[PDB]
Design a protein around this ligand. Structure first.
Ligand SMILES: O=P(O)(O)OC[C@H]1C[C@H](OP(=O)(O)OP(=O)(O)O)[C@H](O)[C@@H]1O
Ligand SMILES: O=P(O)(O)OC[C@H]1C[C@H](OP(=O)(O)OP(=O)(O)O)[C@H](O)[C@@H]1O
Ligand SMILES: [Zn+2]
Ligand SMILES: [Zn+2]
Ligand SMILES: [Zn+2]
Ligand SMILES: [Zn+2]
Ligand SMILES: [Zn+2]
Lengths: 389, 389, 113
């Protein structure tokens, strides 16, 4: 029947992918008939690595999931910078109706938000220089797009994934594989073939390190296509990376000395924040894989904070229906909905509500922005709020 | 059109989810017509956290992907314990044909293998006691099954995921949500309703900690359903976990003193190896989430180690067509295919080849074992080889 | 060496291979010009990777190649151990098995252990 252990769009929208004990919860409630209105909150008590902020992602898919279901869904605009204890999304209705959608909704917000936050932090560490997502090879293809779409919203200029590029409305960029150069049997012959066969609109970055040292193959790629060589890629294997920084400089030198000065240094290969911070000022563009795609999820949890207009939540969870006010200076404030802010408790400024209605009784009362404009939103916040890595 | 940013079984089998630079590689090769036979290897130079071993997973899906494609695919049996530098799967043919399947195949082996290894280590740390996968809520539902199937093969006795349970041929187990007790408005009333409404074959574990202390609610759940109470679940929130061990003991005491002694202690809630190791001898069964589902992928890479019977691979990669011989004492040995082992270099014992043909020219020459029997294979190796955490 | 009553031993400099302009040509000249009693260890790592130049030195003088020297520059020593093994492999696979691994280059106890 099905050749891959994945879930079909229907089975997910159905709720076939939840934890059984949620089904059994619908039974108890339905049979013993315990129908009642509740308001559930979605938050985290922490962010990965105890980071200070995270990037909200997945509000879209969640709306497309609770769509056509007996509940209201308020949320923060996808891409919003958020914090622990601040509800990023609420749901109102008979728990008996939506409760069977935790397993799906939380996963949708969790891993996306995780990848995004990771990305944005990399962006920042790279001094907002260009960074391209290359990680989908380390995860299941089924989610290839959600990932690239998250790396994007996160701040990644481009995405390696084809199908992922499209669904967003972007062109999947890339460079050269080691396979190409090795099957072709010759470095020079390889990037020559690439220069001629591939379109002209495609920047031409030469995959240096293969058989010879990066230092040697770098100039070769230069003295070939010369001004056709947009950049050189360094991905020194771990067994060879004694001092990446130093290696990157030596290449710049050997190129500069031999008069090649337009060719930029593009690097990729197992790198995170700390690794990029120690090499930003000498690299032009970054290719990041696992540190973004295999990023850790945000421990997002769905907890009823109010039942029938009554404030009630379990231990370690905040109680009541609330709103989060943000001023233009990134100062956030979570307060009870029974009250309304206008002044910013701190530096007196105008503050605006973040939880906004997105689904009115199974009806999606909103138009969802295309990826790139959301990403526009993340980077603007990053800069305006002066986010720190 | 599509409401979720996932890839359809077809798009994946198609190759629409790959990194563009692989498509461009097919172009160069196809146009400039550079067709030739190559043997590619799949290995890792390291395992997450620098672990010593890992659990191979995904050999199935990979066969179902390269199915009907101009190549041969040799592999190790799914569930095999492996190591760095040891090819877990090989592919032979015109790179121009399969090269566009790296992004998919590697992802398939990588994340599964990651979750499995994670799982098995937890199993070991838990003194092989029971452990149930609960983590799919932290990842995208599209992969809900691949995950639970990996946690399973890994050593997890049961799985929380419904759809995931089935596809394997297992019953998704579970307990009680906090939502149930909170909407019902009363702890006792809640687990009473559960005791009556749910089938009898379903073990009844009471979700203690909710409003009152675990100590208090534990006895309550006991003096209710009494012998119907199979176990009590402790999931103390982090803000409340001063000393989980101590908390677990106190419960056992308050129960033991009041004569309740059949009720077991079932725990779950943000826990890894180190956390379990400090609590195994006082808990009956474990509920693990993120540490297994959100486990890190195995940096699996596909590299051509031979082109036209000629031994060639890039820097930091081993060259040539080879085989891995394993003795019954877990001693592994990677040697060139041009030679054949029979004696175990170390403790003289009979050694058997691991790379076996699974796909002959796009034809899957093998019947794939059902999940539970593979899992049988992992645990046997764990014990026979005396794997250490 | 002398003042003690010993023969000062050694191998090949990077200068030799670089002035001669070619790895192979270099250790060929060494094989012929220098006495026979002098073990012949080829200075691999120069322009190409140790993995590449190692086999080259093997498929040249073959059984005249007593050993191969690895002195990976610090900027290149990601994992010396691993690098050393990879050489042994590429040599072993291609049937070269008499050639030993000689190493030098900023190393102390912990590094040698
Ligand atoms: O940060 P990581 O998770 O390691 O991944 C980032 C890069 C590097 C790796 O390719 P390389 O090994 O650099 O080269 P190639 O594509 O030729 O295999 C991967 O395919 C991505 O392009
Ligand atoms: O190890 P973790 O990744 O944290 O997840 C493991 C457990 C705990 C958490 O539920 P609880 O918070 O224990 O309770 P509830 O199901 O009622 O929300 C989650 O739903 C899984 O059942
Ligand atoms: Zn490289
Ligand atoms: Zn302010
Ligand atoms: Zn609890
Ligand atoms: Zn043995
Ligand atoms: Zn040297």
């Amino acid at each position: 029947m099905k050749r891959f252990y994945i879930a079909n769009e229907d089975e997910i929208k159905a709720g076939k992918t939840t934890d059984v004990y949620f089904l059994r919860t619908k039974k108890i409630l339905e049979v013993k008939n315990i129908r009642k209105k509740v308001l559930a909150d979605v938050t985290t008590t922490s962010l990965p690595n105890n980071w200070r902020w995270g990037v909200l992602v997945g509000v879209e898919e969640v709306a497309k999931l609770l769509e056509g279901i007996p509940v209201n869904v308020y949320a923060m605009p996808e891409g919003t910078i958020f914090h622990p204890y601040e509800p990023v999304l609420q749901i109102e209705g008979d728990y008996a109706d939506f409760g069977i959608y935790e397993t799906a909704l939380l996963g949708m917000l969790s891993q996306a938000s995780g990848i995004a936050t990771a990305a944005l932090r990399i962006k920042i560490a790279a001094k907002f220089k260009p960074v391209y997502s290359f990680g989908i090879r380390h995860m299941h293809p089924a989610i290839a797009p959600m990932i690239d779409r998250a790396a994007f919203i996160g701040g990644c200029d481009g995405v390696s994934g084809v199908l992922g590029a499209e669904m967003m409305g972007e062109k999947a960029v890339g460079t050269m594989p080691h396979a190409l150069i090795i099957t072709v049997g010759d470095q020079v012959k390889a990037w020559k073939y690439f220069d001629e066969v591939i379109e002209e609109e495609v920047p031409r970055i030469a995959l240096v390190d293969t058989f010879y040292d990066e230092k040697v193959e770098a100039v070769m790629a230069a003295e070939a296509l010369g001004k056709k060589l947009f950049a050189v890629r360094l991905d020194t294997p771990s067994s060879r990376r004694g001092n990446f920084r130093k290696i990157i400089e030596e290449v710049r030198w050997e190129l500069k000395v031999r008069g090649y000065d337009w060719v930029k240094i593009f690097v990729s290969g197992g790198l995170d924040e700390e690794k990029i911070k120690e090499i930003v000022d000498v690299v032009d563009a970054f290719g990041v894989g696992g540190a973004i795609a295999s990023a850790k999820p945000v421990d997002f949890a769905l907890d009823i904070v109010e039942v029938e207009g009554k404030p009630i939540a379990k231990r370690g969870k905040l109680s009541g229906r609330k709103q989060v006010y943000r001023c233009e200076n990134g100062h956030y404030h979570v307060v009870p909905a029974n009250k309304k802010l206008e002044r910013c408790p701190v530096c007196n400024a105008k503050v605006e509500p973040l939880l906004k209605p997105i689904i009115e009784n199974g009806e999606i009362v909103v138009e969802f922005p295309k990826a790139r404009e959301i990403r526009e939103y993340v980077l603007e916040q990053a800069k305006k709020f002066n986010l720190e890595i």
